[PDB]
Amino acid sequence: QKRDIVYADPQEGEEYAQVKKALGNLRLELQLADGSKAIGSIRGAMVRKVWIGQGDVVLVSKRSFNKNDIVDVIHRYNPAEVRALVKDEVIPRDFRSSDERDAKNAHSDYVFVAENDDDGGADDDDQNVLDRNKVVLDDPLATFDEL
Amino acid sequence: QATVNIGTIGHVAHGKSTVVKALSGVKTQKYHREAVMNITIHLGYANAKVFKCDKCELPAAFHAFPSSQPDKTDCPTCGSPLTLKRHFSFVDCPGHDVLMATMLNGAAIMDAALLLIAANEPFPQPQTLEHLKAVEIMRLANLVILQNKIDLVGEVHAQDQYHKIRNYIDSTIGSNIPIIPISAQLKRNIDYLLEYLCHIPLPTRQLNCPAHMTVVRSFDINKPGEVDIENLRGGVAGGTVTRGIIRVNQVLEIRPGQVHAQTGGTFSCTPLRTRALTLKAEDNSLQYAVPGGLIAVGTTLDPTLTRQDKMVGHMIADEGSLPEVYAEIEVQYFLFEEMVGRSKQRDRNAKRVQKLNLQETLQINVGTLTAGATVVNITKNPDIAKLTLVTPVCCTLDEHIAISRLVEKNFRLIGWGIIRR
Amino acid sequence: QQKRSVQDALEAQKVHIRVQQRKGKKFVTSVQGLNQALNFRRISREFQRRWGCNGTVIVTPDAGTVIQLQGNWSEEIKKFLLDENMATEQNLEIHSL
Amino acid sequence: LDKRQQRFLAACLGVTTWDGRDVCFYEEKLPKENDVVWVKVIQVNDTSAVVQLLEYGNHEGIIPYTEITRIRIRAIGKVIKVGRNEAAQVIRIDKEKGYIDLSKKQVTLKEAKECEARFLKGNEVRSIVCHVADECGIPAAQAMEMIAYPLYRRQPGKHAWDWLHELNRNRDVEGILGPLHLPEKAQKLLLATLEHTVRNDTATIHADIEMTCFQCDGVNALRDVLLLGRRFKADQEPQIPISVTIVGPPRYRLRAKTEEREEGMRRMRETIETMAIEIAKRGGILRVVHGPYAL
Amino acid sequence: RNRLPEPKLEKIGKKKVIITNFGRICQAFNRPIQDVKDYIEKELSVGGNLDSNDALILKYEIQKSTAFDNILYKYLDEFVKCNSCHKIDTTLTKEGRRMELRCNWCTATRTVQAVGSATYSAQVGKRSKARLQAM
Amino acid sequence: KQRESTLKQKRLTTGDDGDVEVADRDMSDGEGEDELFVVPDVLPEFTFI
RNA sequence: AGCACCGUGGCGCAGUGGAAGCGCGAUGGGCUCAUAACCCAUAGGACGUUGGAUCGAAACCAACCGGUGCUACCA
Ligand SMILES: Nc1nc2c(ncn2[C@@H]2O[C@H](COP(=O)(O)OP(=O)(O)NP(=O)(O)O)[C@@H](O)[C@H]2O)c(=O)[nH]1
Ligand SMILES: [Mg+2]
């Protein structure tokens, strides 16, 4: 179909952030990967078409007319893309603060690294092309004899 | 035997028994110590002889073990025979919160100590500072400051640290004591360290005044001995001598002696007469004990108690020599302004000491004693308290006392005192 | 005095909390390691009233005076014993998550 | 050594055939109605099951389905299975051609404890009298009938084990051979009955001395106390030393384990009294925990 | 900041969780199989085994996540990771009774102790069946 | 598909021996990816975009 | 350092002299629209090691080794 991954535009609202716990009446509690503590909401195209769990990472928006009102979840990042994001160069895995930075909660927590793609297979596509219009030897039984 | 007693102070997690492990090559245990993990709990002792390495000042590399360095009779570092200079004992005084009182117990024995700080923590913790003021009661002159970890973090943070510490010291205690790098679970830069210990002078002591000994250890009975003569392989008054020559087959009096209960409200304690069976220090056996060094004076008579040390602050002398036993001591006390050992944010933000008042739990650390006291009188003359001690104390000097109070399930130095008596 | 002090500030008194799961997303929780002197009826009956729960005052052989609760609570079964001299902050096992 | 040799040899065999697996323990062919018995489980067969007794030969018996327990079980298999040895009692009994009918569901609130004990005693009696009998000649039937069977008849239901008209008498004390008849097999009987059994295992507390208190003479006093502690004695074992655990400085733990009876209790009490009253005047006083146990 | 294989999961039967990468993980911090397995299974207070093709099985049910990591963190900061430097190259020893562990990248020795839980587990949670089996 | 097979049960009622009959037993999930089965082209373009 | 207890299938254990079993497992089938639940068939044992007692045992005795608990704290 289409892309499963988008990047924040720093202008026009939109900043990465992580869910903490969940609260009633469609709202939840939400915390900033630089700033202090927040409360979020959700949009009505995700009211039960999409479920945003706790400690899932998402992309907010912010109000244009007035800051420091409330913010809203306008997207979700699938776990597949979270590991990728966090790797590259981008967001902290500790979500600066955590609850708070002055209590330094949840210490390392040493890196995990998705270094598990290659298993030591999948080496060499640099080899032969077809040989056709040649008589060549190639009888089986090979190895079968060492005498 | 050892001639000079060298202690160890420093907050826990900065090394204590670690530096000792480097040099001596031995460790201390009691079983309980393992179960709580990296708490030392009671006191260290070990012995390492000094013999000068004769082309050594600071050569680049050698084996990590200290046997190429002193505590050997041959040298491979200079490749030449060795020659005696000195011999030392070690003592390890705790750095954990609770263990203040037992640091105090072992604080009047020593003739010097090493402060230990590490680069992995903040500038001056609370417990470090409290150690220092504790010292100044008993008024040691020689002191040495060290950085235990310098190779576990960079050679940048090291420098800073050193500058700060350097500033702070010689603005508290003069002599401008040196601040020195070492390693001692990698066991390097001993040569450096050792050179500074060599220069620390002979202290003076009296060898012809009536006997005085300070006990801090007891129990050596068995397990085995099991068969034959049957049990055990009688006990000890394992401690230091300050005065006189403790020879074998002398007659000794224990001057706190056996404690007897109150008969209504007044208690009595009767001395214990005992004989020296043998003097044992290190793995060697002595025929006479010279002041300085930990000598295991072999005791005699009856069983019961003195399991690990129930000889806490006990004084041994010769027959017909009696340090005066006092049940009541008139203490002239001076308090500090800061309740050291408090941990809140930073050491410098500390709370201030509350005045000494009637009817409060004290302690009273008279030398090696840990006697419980209650204030009954603040009046006799201003700033004098007539304090009644349940556990009797023997005066041989005017006595230099550190006073400890409970702050929150643990005592924290509050002041110092001197007995008028 | 000091003896008792140590023997208490550095020995025994170790405070167990644990969480498990009954099914799907239902959960359960316990506490153990609290001294016999304290009334269990008064602590349990507090936890309950401060949030839809369900206590007990179970006594089990060689583990006794052990109390459990209904729901996942780990955080608040630690928090409430911190400020209140019930756990020297050193004896706090969590087996949750 | 023909003993060693016989063993190693007979791992390669070809086995020596022996009576371990058959022959009725008592006279009777079959029990009376409502008698507990000790059976073995040959199989299940869905509709009830076929088991065998062991107290009387290998003779069958068959429990009927819906007669194993009160509870729903669904599967019969996973309560009882096969190869077990279990209790059961009787309901009906045909002596005409030997059908017997049993229940496991009427054996309730133990009772099957008695069954264990009973069975075991039986097994002892039997395995004994064969090793006797077949060193010389004669089949087991006859030797049995002349040694085993009398003591089940003479005194009613006292077995050939317990009360002191039976066999374990003749392990303590002798003189009961007389009213029975017995050639050479008397020898082999009594001597196998010794060679195997065993009594077994008994208490072994360890005196505890707490020599609390003081006095211008403790150690010396403690030594004197210690010297009378153990040997002492010796005599044939049980003994009473070694002695051998240091606990604390006042507390000394002396062993004292017996292999034979309550007789160790007397020795410990006497030793403690001598040490405490006559001695312990030169040192502290002797106190007991007590003292015995460990257990 | 070391690199640890990111445990990876499967939801089979909507009860069990199979962990494929088990074998690889245990190798990495240089500790054996059975001992590591014990700690995990004790904390969660579930059954399941290993065996197989060295993929673990557990009766613990969770919504599929990367949140298995918390468990591993506990194990690694108790057992393997020295409190001198912060670094795993570490190697277990047998010293005295209930004494173990050594560091070797600066050789500051450290002891630790091993779980043998058995204090309180509650009860969960069907009955009838329990008594039936314990018949 | 299994979830579609779990929504075909049949039926309620506590007990039929000692154990329970319940349908549904809760699920509020929910789906991940939606893999999207990539091969229009992959590698070369990625160094420009 | 002694005392006490324990050592049996991958793991936890049963088995007081006629002497290889059970529960959890692994692997492969069957029941079910699927999954739990539940049946069945397979392979998997120096009964810690050594000596001794015994017609004969894995079971009893001794020696050593390992594991765990308790008391010991070692000039
Ligand atoms: N890398 C490194 N490790 C060190 C250094 N000094 C000590 N350690 C480590 O720190 C640990 C603590 O040793 P220890 O001396 O018991 O600390 P302590 O401060 O004496 N304990 P206590 O506070 O109770 O006296 C030891 O395992 C040792 O390996 C150092 O300079 N570098
Ligand atoms: Mg230490």
Ligand SMILES: [Zn+2]
């Ligand atoms: Zn390290």
